[PDB]
Amino acid sequence: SSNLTEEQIAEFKEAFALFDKDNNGSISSSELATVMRSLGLSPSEAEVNDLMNEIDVDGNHQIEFSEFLALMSRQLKSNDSEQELLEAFKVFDKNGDGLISAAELKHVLTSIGEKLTDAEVDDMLREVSDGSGEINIQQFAALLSK
């Protein structure tokens, strides 16, 4: 599973309780945009309208700490193992397509910290390597992630 953490949920609770001046834990959409600016965000007027549209169903809607944390998690995203692998292989590939020598491929697998000894890369190189010299990170990146 993957959800917000106590540290992240603690920060939203402080900003949410600040505007929450009733007796439960809900804020109006008019204060939602302001609560995000105080938490450390700055969505353009276009992003605020889209978010307020999903919340405002009949013109009025009280955002609860549950729906608020969900919307914040989508905007405060910061986790991607697959994308992280493609990013590293991109830096090693000066060309731009994604081609590197077996040497650069072994170093990238070690830097990422992948639990794959030489035996694993050997069995994967036989199915990936065809007989040229430079391997593509696209197929190798999928073997490590997908």
UniProtKB/Swiss-Prot annotation:
One of its GO terms (cellular component) is actin cortical patch. The N-terminus is blocked. Keywords: Calcium, Cytoplasm, Cytoskeleton, Metal-binding, Phosphoprotein, Repeat. Changing residue 93 to A: Highly reduced affinity for Ca(2+). Ca(2+) 2 binds at residues 56, 58, 60, 62, 67. It is found in: Cytoplasm, Cytoskeleton, Microtubule organizing center, Spindle pole body. The keyword Metal-binding applies. Pfam families: EF-hand_7. GO terms for molecular function: calcium ion binding; calcium-dependent protein binding; enzyme regulator activity; mitogen-activated protein kinase binding. Residues 7-42, 43-78, 80-115, 116-146 form the EF-hand domain. CDD domains: EFh. Belongs to the calmodulin family. Component of the SPC110 complex containing at least CMD1, SPC29, SPC42 and SCP110. Interacts with SPC110. This is Calmodulin. It comes from Saccharomyces cerevisiae (strain ATCC 204508 / S288c).
